[PDB]
Amino acid sequence: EHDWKKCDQSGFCRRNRAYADHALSAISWESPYKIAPETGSFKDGQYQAIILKTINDHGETVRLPLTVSFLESGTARVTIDEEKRQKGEIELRHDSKARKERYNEAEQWVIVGGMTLDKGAKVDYEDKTQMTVKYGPSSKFEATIKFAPFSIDFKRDGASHIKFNDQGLLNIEHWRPKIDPPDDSTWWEESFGGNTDSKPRGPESVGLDISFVGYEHVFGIPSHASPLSLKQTRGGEGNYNEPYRMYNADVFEYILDSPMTLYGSIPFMQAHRKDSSVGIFWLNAAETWVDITKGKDSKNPLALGVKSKITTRTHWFSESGLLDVFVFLGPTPKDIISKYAELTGTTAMPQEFSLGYHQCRWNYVSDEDVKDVDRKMDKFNMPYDVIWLDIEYTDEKKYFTWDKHSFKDPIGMGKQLEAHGRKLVTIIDPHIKNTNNYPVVDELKSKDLAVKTKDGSIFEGWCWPGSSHWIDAFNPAAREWWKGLFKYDKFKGTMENTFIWNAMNEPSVFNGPEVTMPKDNLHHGNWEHRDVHNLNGMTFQNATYHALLSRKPGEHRRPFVLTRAFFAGSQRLGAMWTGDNTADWGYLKASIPMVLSQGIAGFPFAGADVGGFFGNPDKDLLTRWYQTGIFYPFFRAHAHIDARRREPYLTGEPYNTIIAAALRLRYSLLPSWYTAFRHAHLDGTPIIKPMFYTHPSEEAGLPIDDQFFIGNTGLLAKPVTDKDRTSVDIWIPDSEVYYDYFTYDIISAAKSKTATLDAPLEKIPLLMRGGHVFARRDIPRRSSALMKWDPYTLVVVLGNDRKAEGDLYVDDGDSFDYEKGQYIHRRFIFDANTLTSADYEGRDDASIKEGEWLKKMRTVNVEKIIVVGAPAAWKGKKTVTVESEGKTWAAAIEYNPAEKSRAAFAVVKKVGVRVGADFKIVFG
C-alpha cells in the first residue's frame, strides 16, 4: 500500500506554499528582490544583471545573476542563478561529493534549437526604475523589467499578458549553513517512506508566480488524471486542494480527477481565450509543483468595487536547479506549440507499423501462445501490426535473455510474424539483476555505469528481479554501452522486426520512497537524483532509441520505443502511454483529455491501455474502448496479470463484429493518420486536436475535452464513453456544414450549436467538416505492411463554398531517406469544380532522383473519389475529365441527389491516376 507525499509532507512544497500564504496575507508585501540597476547591460538580444536578494533584517544581500534573452522566434527566456554557488563557495554536508552548482544541464537534454538571439531586439525606454525591451515580429512584443521590487510584464497589442512576480512570490533559497540560533524543521534531513534524505545542500528550491492576465483557462503540464482545462488547487467546489505535482512516479491504481503526479512530466502551460494565446515552459528537471487560482485582479479576488476581468494566478516551484523559463506570446495555440517544438523538438518520424493496432498483455506465456494469437486474429479478420512481450519472456527477469523453457524458438516466432509484415515488441527495463553468471551486470559494475548512493557506492534495490542495480543513462558511456547490447548477433532471438518497450524508468524502485530512488542518489556529473529525477525516464528512452538506429552493419532505420516515464523532449524518441489505468467507464472517459493534453504539450504520440489495464472490462466497455482507442495516436490493448484473457476475438458476438469494424476503420484511415504524424514531425502540430486549438475564436470551445479533430482531415470525433449511452451530443464549433462519416447525413449547417446524434453500441460518432479533403485505403488487409501498395480513395467534403483542401504524405515507413526527399507529399485542392493534386512543398519533378521506393510507388493510384455535398449542377453528368502526365481521359461519375437529411454526393470510380503525379480532375 502506497504512500505519496502531500504538499505538507514535501519540505520545499510546504515552504513555498507558506511563502505564498504569508505574501498574500501580508499588508503591502514587497518581494525582497531588486535589480542593481548599474549592474545591468543590454547587448545583442540579451539583458544581464545582478538581482540582490535581501535575506534578513540587517539588509544583508546575496547576488543572483539574471539573464533575459530575446530570441529570433519572438520567444523570451528568463534565467536566475545563484552567484555563490556558481563559484563553489559553499560547503556540502556529510562530505558529499554532490555538485555545488545549481543544476544547469536540463538545457543540454531538452533544447535542440530555436536559441538564436534577436539582434533586432532593442531598448525602448530605460530610466533607472525600469527598462522596456521591444522584440519579436516587427517589434510587436515588449517586456518591461522593473528593478525594485523585481518584476517583468510581457505585453503585446498594448496589454500585459504574462507577469512575473506581480504577487511577489519569487523565491530562490540561497545556500545557508546548518546553525542553531544565537521554521527550519524541513531544511535538513527529511524522512519519508522508510527513507531518510540526507539533504547535503540544504534548502535550494526555486519558485515564481506567473499571472496570465485576463485568461480564465490554462492547459498543459501533463501527465495528470485531470481535465484538459486545469483546475484550481487552493480549494473551492470542484477544485483541488493540493498543487499539481510533477514527480515521475510509479503510481499503482492511480485515481481519477487528481493533481497527484503520474509517470511523466512536461512543465509547459498555455493560456487561451478568444483570439488570444500565451504560454510558458518551466525548464526544470526537479520535483515541481504548480498551484493555480483564478479571480479578479484585486488582492482579495472576490472584492467588490473592482473590474470583473479574471486573471489566472499560477505558482511554480521546483526543488533545485536554475529558475529557467521561456515565455511564448502566440497569438494562436498553433503558434505557441510550434515555438515550443522548435525549442524542444518535433515528433520523430515513426515506424509506419507503429500506427497500427498493438496487441499486448502481461503475459503471452510461450512462443506457441504468441503464434496461436497471431493465427486467431487472422481467423476472426481482426487486423493488427504488433504482438507484445511483457517481462515473463525473460530468464528470471534478466534483460537481454529469454526463458528457454517457454520461449524455445524466438527467431521462428519472429519469422511467422514477418510473413504478414508484423512485428514483435519486447520489454527492457532499466534495472539489471544483481546475480552471478550474468555478463550484463558484470559489465555495468566494472564499467561504472550504475546509479550510485549518496556516498558513491553503487545503488542497490528491489524490482522485478529482486535485488538489482540501475543503469545511469545520464552517462554517455552507459548509453554507448547499451547500444552494443541490442545488435542482433548480441541480443539473441531478436531480428529486424523486433522493437522495444521501456517501462519502470521513473525509475520504479519497489522498496524506495514513493517507489523511486532516494533523492540523494548520485548520477554521472555528481548531480543528485533530486536535480534530475524528471529527466531520468527520458535518458533511458534515449539510450534505447539510439540502440535501435543500427543493430547490424549497413542498417540505419527508425527506432520504435514505447516509454512510461518522460519529460519535455521525449517526442523525439517515441511513444508514451498513460500507464496502469483501470477497466472502468470513468477511466475510458478520462483517457481522452489525458491524450489530448499530451499532444498540446508537444508529445502527441500517446494513448491509454485499451480495455484498461487493471481488472475485467464488461463486454460493452471493451467494445466502446476499441471505438475510442482507434483515435489514440498510440493504439494498444494491454491487460494486467490477474485479468482474464481478452484478445478481442474472445469477446463474443455482437461485440466481435463491432470491434472488428473499429479496427477496420483505423486501418482504412492509416494514410491520414500517417500524414497527421508527418505534420507533427514538420512543426509539432498535434495529431488529434482539441477545440481550443482548431477554433481559437470560439470561446465556448475552451473547456471542451471530449471531442477532437483528426490531423488535417476535418474529421471530428466524439466517442461514447458512458455506460448504456445510446446517443451523443456533439458540440458543433462553427457555421460550416458537418456530415456523418458513415451515412452523410447533414448534422449541422449554418450555426454553432449542440447537435444530438444516434449512438448505439455499433456506432462510432464521427463527422466530416466541410472544406476538407482526406485520403483513406478501402481495401481491408491483415496488417499495415500488406496495405503498402494498395490504391487510395479521396474524400472531398464540400460546404457552401464548394472549396476544400487536404494532403497526403507517404514514404517507405522505415528509413531516413525522407531526409533526402524520398517521399510523396500531395496537396489536394478543390475549387471551381476542379480537384487538383500538386507537390505539397512545390518541388520540381526530377530535381529529386527516384529511389527504389519511389519507383515502386509508380504502380500506386488514386482509384476513387467521393465528393460529399456535391452541387446540383452535376446532376445528369456522367463523366469527369481527368488530366495527368500529359494524358486526358473521361471517367464515370455517379451523382446521388440529396435525400431526407442525407447529403447529395458523387462517386468517381476507376480514376486510374498515379498518386505521385500532378493531376487535374474537372467535374460538371
Ligand SMILES: OC[C@H]1O[C@H](O[C@@H]2[C@H](O)[C@@H](O)O[C@H](CO)[C@H]2O)[C@H](O)[C@@H](O)[C@@H]1O
Ligand atoms: O511489466 C509488467 C507491468 O509493469 C508495470 O506495471 C506494474 C503493475 O501495474 C503492478 O504490478 O504494480 C507495479 C508497481 O506499481 C507496476 O509497475 C507496467 O506499467 C505494465 O504496463 C506492465 O505490464
